[model samples]
Target: DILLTQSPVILSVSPGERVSFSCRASQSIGTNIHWYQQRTNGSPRLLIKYASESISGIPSRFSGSGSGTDFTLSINSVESEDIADYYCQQNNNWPTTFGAGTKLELKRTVAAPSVFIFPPSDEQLKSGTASVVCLLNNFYPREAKVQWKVDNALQSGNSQESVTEQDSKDSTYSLSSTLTLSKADYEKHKVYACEVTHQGLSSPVTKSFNRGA
Candidate 1:
């Protein structure tokens, strides 16, 4: 898989402004390019595909073009609400990589995601049941991941991740995940952990604790 880089760290756009940016891939990725909208507080939402095809919920004002090793994502007469970051990703390769991302700001401040871990409750402890939640709050650019583990080994418990949701008022994002285990599993695997990956963090955020702790 090839790597991607986007330049122009700061892109100042205005309403009704039409602008474009480039995503330079380390090697040819053909036309298998895709675009995403990463608002101040949200997940990267798919905007376009194959460099040009439309995505279901994306506005017509957002379009894409380019092929081979170079690709472009554009906005036509941008809207005020369109203030957010932009990222380019390639589907032509496995372990698809994303560009560093272009910051499309109307200009203000940037915020990183806040992380927290919720401990298992007393009721769950009594039942030998454990439900652990890992939350990523006040995050931006929606590029994040979570991995679960039990006793240093990868876990295969019943788990669910909530969609990264944006707070309309502040344009910030919030996300959470839960892992559930029965008494037997919880007893044997007293230690549970969740590791997170996100564009905002320089390193993965990991949190772990014993059940009933």
Candidate 2:
């Protein structure tokens, strides 16, 4: 089975800017490549077919080029409404494959996230295990990294991070990261921290959770 790879996983652009995306196939697939546009909460719409053929009703600004294993999708001037995911697919081989997808986002001033860490409840502490949660609220641009630390030392294997979610009202993003450990381990550790890094901020924002507080 052939695989299709997309470049520039995420793109940040302003209105009226030109943009281009590349899609490469694992093996030569000739002019069998196709492109699609997927808006938020909507199905994928075909934009270009047969490597360079424009689909009827599609905007003139949207176009495709290339052949064989290489392909490109270009937008002459991106509009605010053009913010969506684009994908390339190949159907010439025995098994069809689609690219991982390239997300187009409008460039704007990003909002920093508010960080909060919550200790496990008393009931949970009374039990054998406990969980600590770190919440990031009201951020924009959907790009952030989270880290879990115990007593200022980085931790791994026991933490899980949630996908960023968008708020319906403000369109800001939120994310949660959780650390699960035994009550004994929680008692052994003095402090736990949630460190978050976002492009909007100069440094990482950290929220700490005390054993009892």
Candidate 3:
């Protein structure tokens, strides 16, 4: 799965500073598409700037310009009017991936918001066990870090986790995190996440799975 990363929870900007959000794809998304601007406590704002053109209704101050592995989200003027949150998302594939959270605060790294909740995907229900596997888009980062945690507490782990940087047919970098347990472990879908820290990548992408209650 494609790993996306933002500046973290802190997006520092003066009252009026011309700042930009940077987003990069783990693989080449040649002309595919990129999303930007996930508002605070609001829905995502899809800025379809695949070819240097903004889809109508998108705010005039925001725009994206980049293809393949590199992308840039620029806010023409850091107007107080544009103070909120921003993220880079790609609809490039299944289990769509996202960068961590970023707030347009005066300073501090932005953290991705709470786990994005959703109905148990057929994959989860079909797993036959309470634990669900988050299949992230492949990325070329380093070996992945996988584990299971309940109620914010880390659980003793078995060696069930696997790390491979093998190339998929599409030539993308990917990683996987597995949490094993009996059906009881599925009691409540607590926050069980796998964090990946790879080389050449500025920050790791911490994708959370709703493992549901």
Candidate 4:
């Protein structure tokens, strides 16, 4: 019996972007990897086979290449209509197996955000008050959330309303928020953390910092 493992079961892809799928076999398959594309609401179509061989009726951009327990499926400059599920099938041995499948779907390009305390570059906190800022730039859908924590303890003081607006360039969005904290109410040995939740992220992006240690 043979088994195939495909990583990244879900891929929030982008338009006009290239994507690759990896398939690993339990044993040496020796150029027996076959690739298929099952579009949304459609059946699977053969795309590549035998590690770098072209199949009839398939676009020139679709290709496959691998041998001996390793295989890859590549699509050059994928389009929106190309959003589909990709699978890898092995046939070099008895009791053949296939990968669970990887999804190639159109996803908004998320510009990785940067979160930190204000007055950067060797800035120190005093015994007064300071702000923990969450900056989100180049994100889509214009939706996000801001949260604050001190040593894993939630706080609701001097809350700064989240500001989100559309960019002049594309339909993208940028947003920011601040969490105000007073030195008298915070512990110097504790950490101030900022967490941003976005529709484009499967998990919230969290960043933390500590005061004068």
- Per-residue CA lDDT of model 2 for 1-213, tens digit only, reads 889999989887766788999999998999999999998788999999999998999999998999888899999888767778999989999778899999887665589988999999889888899899999888887888899999999998998888653443455678888899999988898889999999888988888967766
Q: What is the lDDT for 4 in model 4?
A: 94
Weakest ten-residue segment in model 4 by summed lDDT: 116-125
The TM-score values for the models, in the order shown, are 0.50, 0.64, 0.45, 0.52
Error of 3 at 34 (Å): 2.3
Which sequence of candidate numbers ranks them by TM-score, best first? 2, 4, 1, 3
User: What tens-digit string does per-residue lDDT give for candidate 3 at 1-213?
Assistant: 888766546665654466777677788767555665654456877765562568788777777787777777777766544556677766666666777756664422222211121234556556655444545454433234444455666667532544433232322334444555555556555676655444434565555655444
Tens digits of per-residue lDDT for model 4, 151-170? 88776765676553333344
Q: Sort by lDDT, best first.
A: 2, 1, 4, 3
Instruction: Report the C-alpha displacement of residue 18, candidate 2, in angstroms.
Output: 1.9
Model 4 scores what on Cα lDDT? Answer: 0.72
Error of 3 at 39 (Å): 2.8
* Better-scoring candidate (TM-score), 3 or 4: 4
The 0-to-1 C-alpha lDDT of every candidate, in the order given, reads 0.78, 0.87, 0.56, 0.72
- Alpha-carbon error at 80 in model 4, in Å? 0.8
Any runs in candidate 2 off by more than 4 Å, and if so which? 1-10, 24-31, 38-44, 52-61, 66-70, 79-85, 91-100, 103-106, 122-127, 138-157, 163-173, 187-199, 202-204, 208-213
Q: How accurate locally is residue 84 in candidate 1, as Cα lDDT from 0 to 100?
A: 73
Q: Per-residue lDDT for 12-71 in model 1, tens only?
A: 654467989889899888898888888756798999999999999788988998888878
